[PDB]
Amino acid sequence: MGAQVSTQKTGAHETIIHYTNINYYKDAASNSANRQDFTQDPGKFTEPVKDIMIKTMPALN
Amino acid sequence: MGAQVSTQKTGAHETIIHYTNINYYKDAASNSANRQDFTQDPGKFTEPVKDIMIKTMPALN
Amino acid sequence: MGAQVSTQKTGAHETIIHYTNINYYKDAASNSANRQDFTQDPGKFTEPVKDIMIKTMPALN
Amino acid sequence: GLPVLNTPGSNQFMTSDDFQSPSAMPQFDVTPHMDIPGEVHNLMEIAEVDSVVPVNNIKA
Amino acid sequence: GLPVLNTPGSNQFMTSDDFQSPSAMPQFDVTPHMDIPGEVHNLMEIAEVDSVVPVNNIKANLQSMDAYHIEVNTGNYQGEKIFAFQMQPGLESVFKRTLMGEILNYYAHWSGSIKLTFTFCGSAMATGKLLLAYSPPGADVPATRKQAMLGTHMIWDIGLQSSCVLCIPWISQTHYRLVQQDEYTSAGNVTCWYQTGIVVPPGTPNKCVVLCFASACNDFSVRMLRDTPFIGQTALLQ
Amino acid sequence: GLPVLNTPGSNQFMTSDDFQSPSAMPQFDVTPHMDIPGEVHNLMEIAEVDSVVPVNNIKANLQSMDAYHIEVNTGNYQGEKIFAFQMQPGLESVFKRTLMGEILNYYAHWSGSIKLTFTFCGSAMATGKLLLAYSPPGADVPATRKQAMLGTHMIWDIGLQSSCVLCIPWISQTHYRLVQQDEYTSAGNVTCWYQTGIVVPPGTPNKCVVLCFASACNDFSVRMLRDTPFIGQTALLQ
Amino acid sequence: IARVADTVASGPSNSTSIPALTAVETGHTSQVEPSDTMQTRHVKNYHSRSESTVENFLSRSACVYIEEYYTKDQDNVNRYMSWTINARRMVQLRRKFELFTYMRFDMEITFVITSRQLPGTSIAQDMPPLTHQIMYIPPGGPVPNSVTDFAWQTSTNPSIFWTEGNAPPRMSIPFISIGNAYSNFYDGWSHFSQNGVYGYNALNNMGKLYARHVNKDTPYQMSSTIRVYFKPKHIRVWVPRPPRLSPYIKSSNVNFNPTNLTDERSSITYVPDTIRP
Amino acid sequence: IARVADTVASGPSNSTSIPALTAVETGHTSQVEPSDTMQTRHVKNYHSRSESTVENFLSRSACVYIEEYYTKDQDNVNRYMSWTINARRMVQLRRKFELFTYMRFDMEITFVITSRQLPGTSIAQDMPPLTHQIMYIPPGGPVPNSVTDFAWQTSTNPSIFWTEGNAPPRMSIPFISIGNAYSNFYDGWSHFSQNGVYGYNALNNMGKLYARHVNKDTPYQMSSTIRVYFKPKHIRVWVPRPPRLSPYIKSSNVNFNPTNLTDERSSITYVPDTIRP
Amino acid sequence: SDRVRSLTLGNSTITTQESANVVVGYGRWPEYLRDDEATAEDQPTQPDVATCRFYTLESVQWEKNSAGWWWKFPEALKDMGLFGQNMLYHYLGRAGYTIHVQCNASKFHQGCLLVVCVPEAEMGCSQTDKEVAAMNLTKGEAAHKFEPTKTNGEHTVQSIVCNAGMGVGVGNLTIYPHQWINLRTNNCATIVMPYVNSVPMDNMFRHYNFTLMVIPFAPLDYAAQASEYVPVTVTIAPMCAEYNGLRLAYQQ
């Protein structure tokens, strides 16, 4: 089938950890949640300044 | 799929003995128990001595 | 998977007759019966004699 | 999940069925097999053995 | 059909499950995606944003801007503690409601450092040096500047650079701590003192406001999803 | 959908099953693994550790260290049996509670040899030779040293080497035995006698203590998981 | 993958580097870390922000509504349910959604329907399993005025038929909004003359949802309670905002009563003494 | 794979080899075997310690709690369940876990909920299937004070909705502990002044678990009994210890009454005569 | 001759001419915390030779009727040189420890002690209905002793030996790092304990990582005119001592 093997979340016996998935429905809205999308970009809220500010330097000068 | 064939435990008709497995869930905590991990090292408790002791020899000399 | 195709027992429309099987459990005791083991050796009970006896000959001579 | 449709005969219990089932005793170490004399494979092995016949089966 | 055996947990309904399900609206044409500014991917992006902390949360200021005011005065005030509080990002009344703490209340576990930024709002003529100290759990709260000075401290010198950051390092025994912090998962305290004092020229205010900001660092993270205890009701709204 | 037929045993709940199940806490970040000393992989690692055996388990010593004491005296004691007991690692009151036996009680089947280590705790001046015998099931318990000597025995000579091991070989008809041993699965008995005697110099104790240790060998193994009969209750604890 | 930043080992310092000094006036949040204001040791941090994901945060079934409808036609009891779909009547889920201004996602809807028999002196029955019918009516569709209205024919409106005892009915729905994203806040009006409806209700219109017993009638009065659950998936959120501080009063607007910024305490220097040997 | 050691064939002996002699003072457990103190025959031992595995030993559902909650609001009967999760109220499973000092593992939790109708003279009913709701509340989350509390909205707390008749509800949970391993024993305090709580309760805090009937009300009083079962999997254990000897008294500490080391008997030389022809 | 051994840690050295090998914890030897297992971000302090040295505690007398003794660490070393000073000024600590119990007699005396290190030795109360007090669990370098009979104290520990004050069998304590001191062969016992805990580090006042118990299984005995005074001294030396969270000293 259109099987798609992904990686499972670390277990309590770490340091065959993968699962299989197949969509049965025609609408993408039927698929399960995307609990594995780990994107980040705090810059939008933490550093929305026009002029890049270097940590080790004075904010104003 | 991400099928993984392993060996079954001996049956009452020994002396096709393998099973198939596929994880359906995204979390490793959902997987079945690891009833086939046979590791051993009694040394920790039976021989936690600093100086190796040879059976056929005197413990003290 | 670890699928294993075998031959089915003759049907009422003889003279695709095969089935598939996969073990899901880790213990061999979980598998289905071995209804297809056709071994025989009546000799143990019908001819447990030390000296081979030829049918077309006298039992004693 | 996978769309499934239960067929008649579900949840029933036929004494002559033959399905797989979970072991109540996981990883049980079966006692080593021992080669014992006179093993039977087919019952016909028995029916092929001569046995005295009670031809004179009168009440007395 | 295929011989099947139902396992325990069948036909149940777990609010945190994740299975597929038939769409009640087949072939629905979703509205074209539009690239909107300020998209959030992880809640931590929010907890990492500085938010004013109501350090002066006394009954009389629970509804005024004075709740955020941290006064500092000119004149001898040696031995006097400007302010202090526990390190409970989600339990401490001081942090409990900040953007950071507000998010932690949706989780039961937390870990990482915290950035306490202090801004002097006095006049451009006012000068001074404050001692921002942080003492890990174990001993009593610093009663004197000497005691506080023995712990992780930062001597802030007021000048052109208005703000000063006091990064509270994650010095815990365990990897994580409960947002509902108890004595076991204690984090310590933060006390502020006068390193020197606030000198000011003639014709200039003697009392100044010092705002406090709190946010998470790049090493911060929450873990146990739970419901926040800051919202409830007695009946369906209308 | 796919034509399916439910097999008997569906929707049931067997405490010893082993299926997959949805996690109530999706994407939970487990705490980093830490390498802790003394990890156990198999319970047999414990049953293989020597533990003091309460051979002198008489009513008067059921709560004193005397329960472990196995006295030996100077002077003629020929024909006298120092001690004796059955070989029931999990049923015999003598072994019933040792680390070894304590584990066997979580299982119904057992097999393998046992190491009975004896340590002389007398003074460095005391000397002597003891006869540690083991008699397999079949005949009456050795009433004399001659009878005991006919079985698997070990003549222990006290000296610099304090301890002496009496390995009880697995001499059974069946591969396994029941922890709840009956006459059928009998294991035999172990009797100790005086090979010679305990001679001692002037100004030295005449009575000495001999401790007994019991543990499993590399050929030991349990098999039938069951609940231990050494723990119970009459109501939920509080 | 979603790992956290590690802490670089830092040693003594004495330079013109001022990572601790800054100016919040710029609207820039300090990007300082422990290693910048003290001596730190190297630490391989394996922690992950996997559960902080907007997906894992909002993707959890939460009750959004609940109503009761009876079987027999006695007194003035409603025999069917009606509901103008929205998630503003349950403070819990409503508060989460309101952490962001705009949202976009598909959704998993689950229904927990339970019945009962009202108290009585002589109520011996033997009613067969109760079958329910939940019908979604998008804006404009004909609305039923009785438990026998023609509208229940469900000719084109999506509907579910469920019998008690079985697993709670469920079904997914895509992104309905006619806009590019659902709006949790609308600082505008419905009319160009700047009047009429103000806020959410001014533009949101997900239609209505009706329920009923398909069973003709019960010997003695019985009632059922349906609970609707929402679980957004394939989530997208924009413009984060200050969490709700004041309790929710109305489900149509953001009205509130002046609430305290937070709990009180003795003084700014108050810290409970927990060490008393 | 997990096979047992075989017995090498040994013959007569007469040397300076002293495998039987040793000294326990070293804290070393003798590694002697039958072949070292007698003549043995070769034996291919096929036995396996596969069931002695810590995994196979602890991975079995064991009851950890049980409470009863009623449907009607009559008298002072609790209509919902509350429980501060822990496995110290059921001696059986508690004793096993306590064979080790530290533990690490995921866990499979199963619930066995059963109901009944309290005795009465006139109790003829016809109640539909009873639906239950089990909600987990991690430390800090809002706790419900009634069977109609807003907390049951389960906005983010994991919750299960189960209807009688179906298979007992189940669900897995990872390794929650904030430490690197669960602690069965804590010889310390909760406060630095060495006071307050002592032991387990001083640090363990898995939160609470609540249950209730989602059904509005029953004509006549009925009650349900929920039984919680734990089944650790993907197990890891450290530092083994002496099994519990004294009966368990409290579920908060290790208090006990001086118990006998073992059963008594006639004398050290007592051995029952089982051979009497 | 493996009988003689020498131990050197810091400015301290122990000598022995009648030992019985050396037990090394659970097969592990003390080691500093690695970066891939650390949590505290601040750079730890490692006094080394300053705290990692042999500290001798108050000796104890072994009598014909002695039932046993026990110490709790690192608490018992709260007033020992600089090791105790770091405990006061720091929130977190981590150490190894090399336990060395001494006890000599003569070829004419007899007895056998059981030197054991019990991790997380949570103990019970005399009155099962009440709780225990820290004061009754550990009292500095002063040893608490086991009793041959039941105790009655309000918040006292059930000192009855047979149960080791833990509700277990004393004969099973051999499952912990241990050694015996059989006077006819021994003269002392050494045990190298590695840091054992479910956490990288922990407080040293609030938590008693392990308990050292010295229980005699063979009663001390001897003839007339034979030295009746047989003391038992305990010496312990921290190993790989690390500290985190520096702040104002803790007032005991």
Ligand SMILES: CCCCCCCCCCCC(=O)O
């Ligand atoms: C078939 C049932 C359809 C139900 C539609 C529900 C849509 C929910 C939209 C929520 C909008 C918002 O929260 O801003």
Ligand SMILES: CCCCCCCCCCCC(=O)O
């Ligand atoms: C969703 C239900 C969560 C229940 C959490 C149970 C955690 C059990 C931890 C047991 C700890 C121990 O036995 O030392």
